């Protein structure tokens with residue numbers, strides 16, 4: 001591979017696949033545009049006003065929010081799938097393996113990219129037109145109060161790495177090509193691709209983050225934290241399954257089935 | 260087979 005050409009190809013594809021980039025999100029979050037400010041959502045009244053001002057649905061806040069997260073997740077799975085197809089070699093893999101890689105990869109990827117939309121105090125919503133506070137999300141009734149908080153905890157640590165979109169494009173590709181997913185039929189060709197992606201990621205980080213020479217190592221070690229969030233999320237979903245008499249979008253059910 | 264929607268997205 002030409003590792004610089006690969007990195008560029010992945011960045012261009014990431015830009016085509018994901019309409020809200022970390023670059024745009026950071027501009028919005030630091031107020032460095034290009035306004036006006038996003039509408040801030042911190043209580044039920046401001047959530048309701050936000051729906052007016054402006055854009056089955058529960059009239060209960062916790063479920064309304066949970067439903068919004070589902071809809072956005074369904075969109076994210078489609079974007080991620082488009083992106084996966086652009087990774088060299090991916091569409092030549094066994095189709096059962098392609099499905100396996102997406103099934104087990106999407107949570108890791110979603111939560112990695114969600115950090116781009118977060119600062120310590122809240123998260124951009126609705127394509128950046130709104131900003132939903134972390135404390136508001138924490139205040140939701142049980143069991144939903146703990147729905148977002150682990151994502152924020154991860155995000156604060158992960159955002160400390162100061163990755164940009166060009167870094168993230170390669171890291172997300174590395175996540176997709178994970179040869180250790182349960183059920184993979186041909187592990188070798190997945191690892192051959194991941195090996196090239198890791199090389200590209202390493203060079204990219206070395207060149208563009210000269211002050212932190214071991215950022216690559218630091219980034220690879222975030223997988224435990226990321227997988228921990230996913231585990232806590234699946235556990236919460238089980239509690240929600242028992243407690244809520246709740247409907248899950250078919251694509252999400254499909255992902256969770258035998259996960 | 261067990262993942263109808265994901266399969267369609269992929270092809």
Ligand SMILES: CC[C@H](NC(=O)c1ccc2c(c1)c(C)c(C)n2Cc1ccc(-c2ccccc2C(=O)O)cc1)c1ccccc1
Pocket residue numbers: 064065066068069070071072073076106107110114117123124125126127132233237252
């Ligand atoms: C993959 C598992 C899946 N998703 C997540 O856990 C998850 C959680 C939050 C997410 C995300 C994912 C993503 C991708 C984002 C961007 N966000 C942030 C977000 C914040 C607010 C809203 C929202 C709330 C109310 C009204 C409108 C909106 C809106 O922005 O449209 C939507 C998304 C999950 C599985 C089962 C149930 C719920 C979620």
